[PDB]
Write a protein that binds this DNA or RNA. Structure first.
Ligand SMILES: [Mg+2]
Ligand SMILES: [Mg+2]
Ligand SMILES: [Mg+2]
Ligand SMILES: [Mg+2]
Ligand SMILES: [Mg+2]
Ligand SMILES: [Mg+2]
Ligand SMILES: [Mg+2]
Ligand SMILES: [Mg+2]
Ligand SMILES: [Mg+2]
Ligand SMILES: [Mg+2]
Ligand SMILES: [Mg+2]
Ligand SMILES: [Mg+2]
Ligand SMILES: [Mg+2]
Ligand SMILES: [Mg+2]
Ligand SMILES: [Mg+2]
Ligand SMILES: [Mg+2]
Ligand SMILES: [Mg+2]
Ligand SMILES: [Mg+2]
Ligand SMILES: [Mg+2]
Ligand SMILES: [Mg+2]
Ligand SMILES: [Mg+2]
Ligand SMILES: [Mg+2]
Ligand SMILES: [Mg+2]
Ligand SMILES: [Mg+2]
Ligand SMILES: [Mg+2]
Ligand SMILES: [Mg+2]
Ligand SMILES: [Mg+2]
Ligand SMILES: [Mg+2]
Ligand SMILES: [Mg+2]
Ligand SMILES: [Mg+2]
Ligand SMILES: [Mg+2]
Ligand SMILES: [Mg+2]
Ligand SMILES: [Mg+2]
Ligand SMILES: [Mg+2]
Ligand SMILES: [Mg+2]
Ligand SMILES: [Mg+2]
Ligand SMILES: [Mg+2]
Ligand SMILES: [Mg+2]
Ligand SMILES: [Mg+2]
Ligand SMILES: [Mg+2]
Ligand SMILES: [Mg+2]
Ligand SMILES: [Mg+2]
Ligand SMILES: [Mg+2]
Ligand SMILES: [Mg+2]
Ligand SMILES: [Mg+2]
Ligand SMILES: [Mg+2]
Ligand SMILES: [Mg+2]
Ligand SMILES: [Mg+2]
Ligand SMILES: [Mg+2]
Ligand SMILES: [Mg+2]
Ligand SMILES: [Mg+2]
Ligand SMILES: [Mg+2]
Ligand SMILES: [Mg+2]
Ligand SMILES: [Mg+2]
Ligand SMILES: [Mg+2]
Ligand SMILES: [Mg+2]
Ligand SMILES: [Mg+2]
Ligand SMILES: [Mg+2]
Ligand SMILES: [Mg+2]
Ligand SMILES: [Mg+2]
Ligand SMILES: [Mg+2]
Ligand SMILES: [Mg+2]
Ligand SMILES: [Mg+2]
Ligand SMILES: [Mg+2]
Ligand SMILES: [Mg+2]
Ligand SMILES: [Mg+2]
Ligand SMILES: [Mg+2]
Ligand SMILES: [Mg+2]
Ligand SMILES: [Mg+2]
Ligand SMILES: [Mg+2]
Ligand SMILES: [Mg+2]
Ligand SMILES: [Mg+2]
Ligand SMILES: [Mg+2]
Ligand SMILES: [Mg+2]
Ligand SMILES: [Mg+2]
Ligand SMILES: [Mg+2]
Ligand SMILES: [Mg+2]
Ligand SMILES: [Mg+2]
Ligand SMILES: [Mg+2]
Ligand SMILES: [Mg+2]
Ligand SMILES: [Mg+2]
Ligand SMILES: [Mg+2]
Ligand SMILES: [Mg+2]
Ligand SMILES: [Mg+2]
Ligand SMILES: [Mg+2]
Ligand SMILES: [Mg+2]
Ligand SMILES: [Mg+2]
Ligand SMILES: [Mg+2]
Ligand SMILES: [Mg+2]
Ligand SMILES: [Mg+2]
Ligand SMILES: [Mg+2]
Ligand SMILES: [Mg+2]
Ligand SMILES: [Mg+2]
Ligand SMILES: [Mg+2]
Ligand SMILES: [Mg+2]
Ligand SMILES: [Mg+2]
Ligand SMILES: [Mg+2]
Ligand SMILES: [Mg+2]
Ligand SMILES: [Mg+2]
Ligand SMILES: [Mg+2]
Ligand SMILES: [Mg+2]
Ligand SMILES: [Mg+2]
Ligand SMILES: [Mg+2]
Ligand SMILES: [Mg+2]
Ligand SMILES: [Mg+2]
Ligand SMILES: [Mg+2]
Ligand SMILES: [Mg+2]
Ligand SMILES: [Mg+2]
Ligand SMILES: [Mg+2]
Ligand SMILES: [Mg+2]
Ligand SMILES: [Mg+2]
Ligand SMILES: [Mg+2]
Ligand SMILES: [Mg+2]
Ligand SMILES: [Mg+2]
Ligand SMILES: [Mg+2]
Ligand SMILES: [Mg+2]
Ligand SMILES: [Mg+2]
Ligand SMILES: [Mg+2]
Ligand SMILES: [Mg+2]
Ligand SMILES: [Mg+2]
Ligand SMILES: [Mg+2]
Ligand SMILES: [Mg+2]
Ligand SMILES: [Mg+2]
Ligand SMILES: [Mg+2]
Ligand SMILES: [Mg+2]
Ligand SMILES: [Mg+2]
Ligand SMILES: [Mg+2]
Ligand SMILES: [Mg+2]
Ligand SMILES: [Mg+2]
Ligand SMILES: [Mg+2]
Ligand SMILES: [Mg+2]
Ligand SMILES: [Mg+2]
Ligand SMILES: [Mg+2]
Ligand SMILES: [Mg+2]
Ligand SMILES: [Mg+2]
Ligand SMILES: [Mg+2]
Ligand SMILES: [Mg+2]
Ligand SMILES: [Mg+2]
Ligand SMILES: [Mg+2]
Ligand SMILES: [Mg+2]
Ligand SMILES: [Mg+2]
Ligand SMILES: [Mg+2]
Ligand SMILES: [Mg+2]
Ligand SMILES: [Mg+2]
Ligand SMILES: [Mg+2]
Ligand SMILES: [Mg+2]
Ligand SMILES: [Mg+2]
Ligand SMILES: [Mg+2]
Ligand SMILES: [Mg+2]
Ligand SMILES: [Mg+2]
Ligand SMILES: [Mg+2]
Ligand SMILES: [Mg+2]
Ligand SMILES: [Mg+2]
Ligand SMILES: [Mg+2]
Ligand SMILES: [Mg+2]
Ligand SMILES: [Mg+2]
Ligand SMILES: [Mg+2]
Ligand SMILES: [Mg+2]
Ligand SMILES: [Mg+2]
Ligand SMILES: [Mg+2]
Ligand SMILES: [Mg+2]
Lengths: 274, 47
RNA sequence: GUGGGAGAGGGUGGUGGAAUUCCCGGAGUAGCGGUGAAAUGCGCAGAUACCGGGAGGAACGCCGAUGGCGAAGGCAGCCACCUGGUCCACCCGUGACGCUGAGGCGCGAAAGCGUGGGGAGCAAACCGGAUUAGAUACCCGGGUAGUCCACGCCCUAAACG
RNA sequence: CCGAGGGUAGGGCCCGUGACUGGGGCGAAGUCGUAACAAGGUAGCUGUACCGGAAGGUGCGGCUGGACACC
RNA sequence: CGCGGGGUGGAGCAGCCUGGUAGCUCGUCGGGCUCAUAACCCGAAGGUCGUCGGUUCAAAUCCGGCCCCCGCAACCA
RNA sequence: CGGGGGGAACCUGGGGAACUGAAACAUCUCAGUACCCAGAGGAGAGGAAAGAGAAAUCGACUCCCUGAGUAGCGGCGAGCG
RNA sequence: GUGGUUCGUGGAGCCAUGGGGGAAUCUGGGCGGACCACCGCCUAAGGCUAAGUACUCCGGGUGACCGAUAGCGCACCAGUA
RNA sequence: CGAGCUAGCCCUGGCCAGGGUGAAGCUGGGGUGAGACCCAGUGGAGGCCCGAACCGGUGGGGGAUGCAAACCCCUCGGAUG
RNA sequence: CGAAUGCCGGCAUGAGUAACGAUAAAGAGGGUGAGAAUCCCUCUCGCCGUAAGCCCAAGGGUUCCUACGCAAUGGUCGUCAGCGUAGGGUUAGGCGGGACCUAAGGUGAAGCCGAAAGGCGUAGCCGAAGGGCAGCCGGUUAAUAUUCCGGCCCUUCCCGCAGGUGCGAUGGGGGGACGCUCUAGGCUAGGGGGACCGGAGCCAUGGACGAGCCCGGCCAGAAGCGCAGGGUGGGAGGUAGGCAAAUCCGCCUCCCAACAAGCUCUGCGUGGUGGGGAAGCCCGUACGGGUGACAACCCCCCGAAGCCAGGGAGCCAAGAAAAGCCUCUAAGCACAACCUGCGGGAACCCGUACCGCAAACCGACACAGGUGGGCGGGUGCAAGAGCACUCAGGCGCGCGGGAGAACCCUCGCCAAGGAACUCUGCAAGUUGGCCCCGUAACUUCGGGAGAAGGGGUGCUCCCUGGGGUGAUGAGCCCCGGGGAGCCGCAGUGAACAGGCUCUGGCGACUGUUUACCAAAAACACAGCUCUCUGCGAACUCGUAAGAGGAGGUAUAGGGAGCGACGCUUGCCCGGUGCCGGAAGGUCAAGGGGAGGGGUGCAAGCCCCGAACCGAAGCCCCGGUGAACGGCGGCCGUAACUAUAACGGUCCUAAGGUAGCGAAAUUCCUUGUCGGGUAAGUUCCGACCUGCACGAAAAGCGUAACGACCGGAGCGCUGUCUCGGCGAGGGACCCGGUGAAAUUGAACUGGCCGUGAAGAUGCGGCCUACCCGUGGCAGGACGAAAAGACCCCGUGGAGCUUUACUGCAGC
RNA sequence: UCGAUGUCGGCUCGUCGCAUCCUGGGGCUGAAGAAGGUCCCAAGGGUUGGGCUGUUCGCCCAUUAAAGCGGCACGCGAGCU
């Protein structure tokens, strides 16, 4: 839980660093399982399609396993819990008895040294993975497939988790970390436990620069801009928003629901966070 | 103070070069015009 | 010491049923609520009353006492674990090892505070209805903190026998 | 050398004093309401929180120094 | 100087727009309930409508002048 | 066996402006212009009537003259034709 | 739904076609300016086709065309410095 | 036709004299029922301090047909981010 | 052609005027020559020395070297040159690139998309200042040299012979292979000292023949060894993974090592050997050649940021790829092939001169500007790349000579006074390094702090402590301690080196910005809140394909406000926006065909067309304030007066709460009172009558921070009373070179009038010989810019919206 | 005067008018003296330093013989700010 510093600088006071004692490995990662990556914020047109992005530490991309099922039945021992810079969570190194090594996103309370399996067979125990249909109702669960054999989409982020409310036909009813209630297909693998590194939400960046290390560049408000630039700008000596609050592209930003209406996905949802 | 001409022999060739022009219909036209005018150099000479 | 006892004593983890609220489904119609009487509110966009389903939070009816336990504050569905105090019996050990206690340390209802969660019912503040001379009240309809949980503070009380 | 003392500098404490400001005491017959004393006309008091011209109200918990009809 | 709304029983408001009649709350006065006062009940009274012209048959009402009232504007310099 | 690329202008096809004019400006004009693209050649396009359009008439296409600034079209404006 | 024509939605036919529907083979089908009848014209949904036409890098001939501030930007080692 | 200037991002390299301050941690002693803690040492943190290179451009003077189409002198900001 | 600030060209005026481009600086002797301040040589003097010296990369493109030249180019001169003419000059298997690798990106069989041109895209290919790879020290030329020569090493191909082995790749596996800060041990680079080794010579001017003075005391070097390091377990069994196959790698188990013990690689050292090798003196050099010599060739110390190197720790932001290389097997081959060693042979292309912090590059210039990497010695000052002087090396900045006015610039100093200067201490000055003493409010406990204020500071002799390296010894080097003394105005003796305090505003803070008039209180910022987004996410770019988002998944991502932290952020949902609403109303195409029309003999063809069913939207119903926003008026009242806790009445969706308030907001206004001052429109503290504060366009505070803006004191001053003198660079004079804007023409005076209303030019009068030089700016409505303000134009453009009308989007 | 007549204040340098602030000279006085009042003559000379504000102006402090008012493109930016 959250290293803190004395204020021997300003901004050292409220700054706060993650507790790494969970980390059993450091300075790997298994060199067999990871390439590199790049971006800039820019798309293939050389064009910024997401603003305020770049700088930030060089990163190696640890390749991780979002299908647990291709390996049904082969257990594995957990060799390490290390540091993934490309996500909120920590990755678990697991050696299979296959002699195969894979990375997994590491559940809260997964001990280095224990055994994990995936398949309809599996014990309901932290780290294991099953078709949703075979997890008992009420089980809190993470890394969920949205569609069968397509990979883990839902609840991957530090401290997230999901819950099985019940079952209907080929579908089980899930509460997502949004709180929305969703029907997910029975056949969808999911791995029991919550995601952990839960204390993630409590770090305090604490100085400007630390926000840069994460490759987030400064964010300038419409509010201080000229009219060419933004629906909020000009005339100054400040100003209220002078109109219903808008994005730079002009659509409204307090209240407007942007989810498409006619999505087939709609007949599989029952609730609200969006 | 630093000025607008900072020659670099490679930048010149990949920019205004002969295969640069040839690569794009705008540029093929550049040559076309340049050639039709009777230009001695169709494209900057870079050592 | 030995052997035995009663008990909401404290901590952790689970777990059960009643009820309230909301959501879905069925059925069904012209009211329902609420009061001293009303009004605000809710209701033909199908309410209330009825059955079926699901979600969730809080509190534990009878037993219950005019009872029990703890130093106090305090402690009440059920189960397990860890753990305190205390009474009895037998006369077995030590041999004055006692009492009290300025300071110190620790505990300490409710409210309140900090960072997370959770939020059904309740409900300061707030709004509306009514009463009144007026009502920044009492009654009624709404209702956010809070109430609950983890950690951390605060250290008050008709903390009373 | 030490040395009364003078000088320059920076602190401590104590008295007096100050536009204004806070509440307090006192003052034969001022204005506003009725909080308490009798179930005081909402039992009261209470720690704490919020609110309100004012006494006070309400929440939560607490104390009694409060309780012959009747369902 | 400018534009806009205004001035009505003691107070505060309607009525004027669209001519004919002046209305609502409080206050005031008379009576009542009460030991008494207020509350409350029953009754009354009070106004020429800023002022001076003008229009009409008739003017708070429509038009003009002056007096005041509130508001707005007074920029480039 | 053929294609590719180049050619002053000219030609056909795919796309296609604005200034301007309307004494402001939207329809309208400029204008199917400028320009970009593809193709063709020494030409290119067109071409042998499911045509004209009132005469029981003319007969493929293209180019000039005329018909004619006529029929018309038109914020029935400017103007187009 | 549009484009073309003089046709700007107009009585708007004709020619073309992006969408929907969707025939017949001579007694069949298209047109003559919405539509109807009559009377005429013509035979769509395959293709080719000289010449009369356009142009001028190039060669020639000619000039009430210039004569070095003209005439091409260049009479000259100019699309150069 | 331009990102050989200037702006941002991407890939891959390089640069930052010297001094100063002394965070966590560790160790040891004290402390206690076990703690929190305390002190000493070690340690070497930081959009920390002073200040060159480098990067700036605060104030003033000079320049003003300039050395210069933004320069010069003095001073001044940052200087492991 | 006379006018167009016309066009092209020529030539004037300013005018022998301003300048002649860093204030590092010159003097003489000799030489050459038609000609010399300016070329060559010597001597003296000055300037650079973390450079203004040397090397590399860009870029430049013969500028290089030499002979002959001086018309132009050179800011003067030129006999010189980077200039003209000519001739010469650049040498590589090992240095850099390429017959290697891959990075971003580019390109692109497959594929996808797009009217056309074209856009995309896996693999592949291309792409380097990154990975990989074999050369070090001398000598030589006028001019190239890791290139040629000398010497000692080395690499890859081809072929052969010997030995060895299941050989074999583009396929599997390993490796390559990685951050930032701190950093150990050993070395090397470099450097200082030496009484020791080698060396021409020197005794000056009072002294010194000296353990004097001055110069030098190295460099490369295979094998072997030695020291310091890097890397690295061995064997068996099992095996289902590493898209086939493995004997390899992964995983489980068993067995010995824990250690560099071996094996292995690299650094230094030493190494057969090769080579350098000063002062000074003679000569002769754009330059360097003999001797010194047969040179010496050694000890000590200092010591990297470099090396061993994938070293070590710590920390969080979590730190390229591919080949080379090794291994493993597959076909295929086992005659082959590969492996190790030796040997012969073969080893291509392009760069190579010269400039390179600049007179050769970018700036029209031989421009005080800009330009990436490496070396960058000595001493002294705490250290240091700082500063002063100085080595090697390089330079005196391509107009000079005089004079010693005003004035200007840059600099020095001043009686008494000390901010009186002024918008303002602007500017200058004070302060200044190190050591020691000491140090307040306040505080988020870190700070505030270099707070403030002080004391010390040199040289000499005496005694003494610990460290490093040697040995636990001297010597060398480092850090000190105590005592007695000497000198001056003064010891950080020159140079580099904070003035301080009180107190308000605003922004928490470090940061960022208007290149080139604003660095700020603006932007950013951690952090808070709202909102959207279930993932083929929302959102963005694109016609599309595709991409970003993100190889992310609600502890995430997008949008928007607010802007550390503290304490807080009230009321109004009427309008607007959004959100919810399965009824209702209306609503387009379409469906429907009541009825009506055209025409036909007619069958028919054809054209209308009411009911009714029929989306979104709008209306309607609610909700919603860290959504756009909004948060009253009049009148009365208390036993002095005043004032109004209280009441009355109109309107509202609701009437501004807490805080704060003459404010970055207050008009009246220099409000009133207090404070500070002899005096205070500012400043601070109050009051509240807030024209016209007020709670995330956030309210009130807040330690710390600030080249922000305001107020006050101390200190100190030429800021001032109030000026004076002095220095240098201009200005002036002489010789050389010689511009510019401007310019209707000029023979160009004052006053009072006049005049288109401000006259050298008209009237009257006055004054006035001709022509310059140095000076000052009153005038020529002086120069410059076809006024930016203002208006006009049915002129433009950027911006906004409940202007109009479209369009994209939904 | 818009093909440019730079705008407040300050500083510097002045010069002029007199409707005189002082000094000289006078008349009247409700002028005893001294000291004032008020008007007349008179432009020779003189007319302070400082606090506040950008200020002109004004208020204020300390003095003075006095602490004058105007003009000169609200004199003066090819003179400075
Ligand atoms: Mg591109
Ligand atoms: Mg921002
Ligand atoms: Mg702006
Ligand atoms: Mg833009
Ligand atoms: Mg906009
Ligand atoms: Mg705005
Ligand atoms: Mg503005
Ligand atoms: Mg504003
Ligand atoms: Mg240029
Ligand atoms: Mg290049
Ligand atoms: Mg040629
Ligand atoms: Mg018990
Ligand atoms: Mg006993
Ligand atoms: Mg005994
Ligand atoms: Mg408590
Ligand atoms: Mg509580
Ligand atoms: Mg009551
Ligand atoms: Mg009470
Ligand atoms: Mg009472
Ligand atoms: Mg009561
Ligand atoms: Mg209440
Ligand atoms: Mg009465
Ligand atoms: Mg304006
Ligand atoms: Mg066409
Ligand atoms: Mg027009
Ligand atoms: Mg026009
Ligand atoms: Mg117009
Ligand atoms: Mg047209
Ligand atoms: Mg033809
Ligand atoms: Mg036309
Ligand atoms: Mg048409
Ligand atoms: Mg029309
Ligand atoms: Mg038509
Ligand atoms: Mg027929
Ligand atoms: Mg037919
Ligand atoms: Mg047809
Ligand atoms: Mg026809
Ligand atoms: Mg017809
Ligand atoms: Mg026909
Ligand atoms: Mg010809
Ligand atoms: Mg000519
Ligand atoms: Mg001639
Ligand atoms: Mg010509
Ligand atoms: Mg760039
Ligand atoms: Mg350092
Ligand atoms: Mg340091
Ligand atoms: Mg440090
Ligand atoms: Mg720093
Ligand atoms: Mg730079
Ligand atoms: Mg400057
Ligand atoms: Mg700069
Ligand atoms: Mg000047
Ligand atoms: Mg900084
Ligand atoms: Mg600094
Ligand atoms: Mg530094
Ligand atoms: Mg960085
Ligand atoms: Mg003329
Ligand atoms: Mg001119
Ligand atoms: Mg001349
Ligand atoms: Mg002259
Ligand atoms: Mg001169
Ligand atoms: Mg010079
Ligand atoms: Mg001679
Ligand atoms: Mg040096
Ligand atoms: Mg030369
Ligand atoms: Mg010459
Ligand atoms: Mg010359
Ligand atoms: Mg080859
Ligand atoms: Mg390649
Ligand atoms: Mg492409
Ligand atoms: Mg390379
Ligand atoms: Mg090489
Ligand atoms: Mg050499
Ligand atoms: Mg040394
Ligand atoms: Mg002698
Ligand atoms: Mg050696
Ligand atoms: Mg295997
Ligand atoms: Mg296999
Ligand atoms: Mg050696
Ligand atoms: Mg390491
Ligand atoms: Mg090691
Ligand atoms: Mg093998
Ligand atoms: Mg085989
Ligand atoms: Mg060479
Ligand atoms: Mg330089
Ligand atoms: Mg350099
Ligand atoms: Mg040079
Ligand atoms: Mg050059
Ligand atoms: Mg220039
Ligand atoms: Mg020069
Ligand atoms: Mg230069
Ligand atoms: Mg140059
Ligand atoms: Mg530089
Ligand atoms: Mg020093
Ligand atoms: Mg160095
Ligand atoms: Mg220096
Ligand atoms: Mg001179
Ligand atoms: Mg002088
Ligand atoms: Mg003085
Ligand atoms: Mg003094
Ligand atoms: Mg002032
Ligand atoms: Mg200063
Ligand atoms: Mg103090
Ligand atoms: Mg000091
Ligand atoms: Mg001394
Ligand atoms: Mg001395
Ligand atoms: Mg040593
Ligand atoms: Mg100094
Ligand atoms: Mg300093
Ligand atoms: Mg202020
Ligand atoms: Mg700031
Ligand atoms: Mg900014
Ligand atoms: Mg600008
Ligand atoms: Mg600027
Ligand atoms: Mg700044
Ligand atoms: Mg600036
Ligand atoms: Mg789109
Ligand atoms: Mg991705
Ligand atoms: Mg803001
Ligand atoms: Mg703020
Ligand atoms: Mg609010
Ligand atoms: Mg309120
Ligand atoms: Mg509202
Ligand atoms: Mg509403
Ligand atoms: Mg609303
Ligand atoms: Mg409906
Ligand atoms: Mg009929
Ligand atoms: Mg609808
Ligand atoms: Mg509503
Ligand atoms: Mg009174
Ligand atoms: Mg005030
Ligand atoms: Mg004031
Ligand atoms: Mg205000
Ligand atoms: Mg004021
Ligand atoms: Mg104040
Ligand atoms: Mg405000
Ligand atoms: Mg607000
Ligand atoms: Mg404030
Ligand atoms: Mg503050
Ligand atoms: Mg700063
Ligand atoms: Mg600042
Ligand atoms: Mg002076
Ligand atoms: Mg004359
Ligand atoms: Mg005159
Ligand atoms: Mg005359
Ligand atoms: Mg003048
Ligand atoms: Mg003038
Ligand atoms: Mg004009
Ligand atoms: Mg108009
Ligand atoms: Mg216009
Ligand atoms: Mg003008
Ligand atoms: Mg002028
Ligand atoms: Mg007079
Ligand atoms: Mg007298
Ligand atoms: Mg006078
Ligand atoms: Mg004034
Ligand atoms: Mg005065
Ligand atoms: Mg003036
Ligand atoms: Mg000026
Ligand atoms: Mg002025
Ligand atoms: Mg002037």
């Amino acid at each position: 839980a959250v290293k803190k510093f004395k204020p021997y600088t300003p901004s050292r006071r409220f700054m706060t660093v993650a507790d790494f004692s969970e980390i059993t490995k450091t300075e790997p990662e298994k060199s067999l399982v990871k390439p590199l990556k790049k971006t800039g914020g820019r798309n293939n047109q050389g064009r910024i399609t997401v603003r305020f992005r770049g700088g930030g530490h060089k990163r190696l991309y640890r390749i991780i396993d979002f299908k647990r099922w291709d390996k049904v039945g082969i257990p594995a021992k957990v060799a390490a819990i290390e540091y993934d810079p490309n996500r909120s969570a920590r990755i678990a190194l697991l050696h299979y008895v296959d002699g195969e090594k894979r990375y997994i996103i590491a559940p809260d309370g997964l001990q280095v040294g224990q055994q994990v399996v995936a398949g309809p067979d599996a014990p309901i125990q932290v780290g294991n993975a099953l078709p949703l249909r075979f997890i008992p109702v009420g089980t809190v669960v993470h890394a969920v497939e949205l569609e069968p054999k397509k990979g883990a989409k839902l609840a991957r982020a530090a401290g997230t988790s999901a819950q099985i409310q019940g079952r209907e036909g080929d579908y089980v009813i899930l509460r997502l970390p949004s709180g929305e209630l969703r029907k997910v297909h029975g056949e969808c693998y999911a791995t029991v436990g919550a995601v952990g590194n839960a204390d993630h939400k409590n770090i305090v960046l604490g100085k400007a620069g630390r926000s840069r290390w994460l490759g987030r560049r400064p964010h300038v408000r419409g509010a201080a801009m000229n009219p060419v630039d933004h629906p909020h700008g000009g005339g100054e000596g400040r100003a209220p928003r002078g109109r219903p609050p808008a994005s730079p592209w002009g659509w409204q930003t307090k209240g407007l629901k942007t989810r498409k209406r006619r999505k087939p996905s709609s007949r599989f949802i029952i609730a609200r966070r969006k | 103070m630093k000025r607008t001409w900072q020659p670099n022999r490679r930048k010149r060739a990949k920019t205004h070069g002969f295969r640069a022009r040839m690569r794009t219909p705008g540029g093929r036209k550049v040559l076309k015009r340049r050639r039709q005018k009777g230009r001695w150099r169709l494209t900057p000479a870079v050592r």
